[PDB]
């Protein structure tokens, strides 16, 4: 009957709260430190600027003068940056939920340590996720492609540069934002299956 | 020789690259036929008029509340958001069924013209076609609610109504012209693109057995 230890539950409780506050960016910071959705915004704008950078580059191409191939260029020239930002937005996130592990879960090294491993585990698999909707999101944009002519092409670069600037970042939060912060939540409830374990977190 | 039955082989070459044809839009018609491509681009023109239909509506339902606020002061907007984004959900995939069925009768008159004489052939053809239809339209389906999923979870001290009204301006703005070619791109990608090349390497796949060819 000493296992009165499900009262690790109120533990996980507030710790799974902390969670959810930085998923929907309403976490609570000092005056010398910075908010986890800036350090995420950061990331994201440096993309729109690197978008920009490319767009003006195919502009000042075609400007100067089959079709496909230069959009097929434009894209593989942003698969980099892209998967880059999304690595940067990852490790920022996955530092942040740890930080609240190690508040919640400073004082007992079993249940950090497994918390944490918990925190690895998930990451991995979202990343997983966001990589994929971000490789088939630049997959559509080329497969899907087919007298001063030359603007159309401008506005659809431009368009499309405009779309990719908010489409990448979404499937990054949906993913490393929402998706892991829930999968996360569930997988810390879960973890209180096998009783045997009890005593030793 | 009396296996000159691998003429199959060139059956096949040219029902697949009459395929290809109408997956890059360079199908071959009457002049009392339109193409697919432009059957298709048809009903995503449909689909952009619903989205800036709905979307000048939500516009004017904000601005209305911000008003409204305003002249007071001298979660509303998310219930209001998440009711424009649902609303979206049944066009777009009633958009998906109408494509799924003009796509699906072009491949079968393609299996007809090529087929028509072998019917165990164009009999299992067109069942190979049904599967990868049915198939590829579960994969579009879910592209889709998942592209409605993330923008409702995307979208989401002190503040001001003059900022919340931009802000949510600048957000109709973009989101509409998103959704525009959003949802199209996954139904081409997966009705067009991936659902041709399925059968085409569905295609191939037959060439292999080959004490079925008597029967075909």
Do not use: C
């Not at 994201?44 to 195919?58: E, H, M, R, S």
């Not at 940067?88 to 592990?101: D, G, P, S």
């Not at 007992?108 to 088939?136: G, R, W, Y």
């Not at 659809?156 to 999968?183: C, H, V, W």
């Amino acid at each position: 009957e000493a296992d009165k230890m499900f009262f690790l539950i109120e533990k996980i409780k507030m710790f799974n709260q902390d969670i959810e506050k930085l998923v929907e960016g309403e976490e609570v910071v000092r005056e010398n430190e910075t908010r986890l959705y800036n350090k995420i915004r950061e990331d994201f704008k440096n993309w729109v600027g690197i978008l920009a950078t490319n767009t003006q580059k195919v502009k000042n191409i075609i400007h100067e003068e089959t079709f496909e191939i230069i959009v097929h260029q434009y894209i593989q020239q942003l698969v980099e940056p892209a998967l880059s930002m999304l690595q940067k937005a990852m490790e920022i996130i996955q530092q942040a939920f740890i930080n609240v592990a190690k508040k919640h879960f400073g004082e007992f090294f079993n249940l950090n340590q497994t918390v944490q491993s918990t925190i690895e585990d998930i990451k991995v698999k979202h990343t997983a996720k966001a990589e994929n909707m971000i490789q088939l999101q630049f997959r559509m944009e080329q497969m899907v492609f087919k007298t001063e002519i030359g603007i159309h092409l401008n506005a659809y670069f431009l368009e499309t540069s405009k779309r990719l600037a908010n489409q990448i970042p979404f499937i990054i939060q949906y993913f490393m934002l929402r998706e892991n912060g829930d999968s996360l939540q569930k997988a810390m409830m879960q973890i209180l299956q096998e009783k045997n374990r009890y005593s030793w977190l």
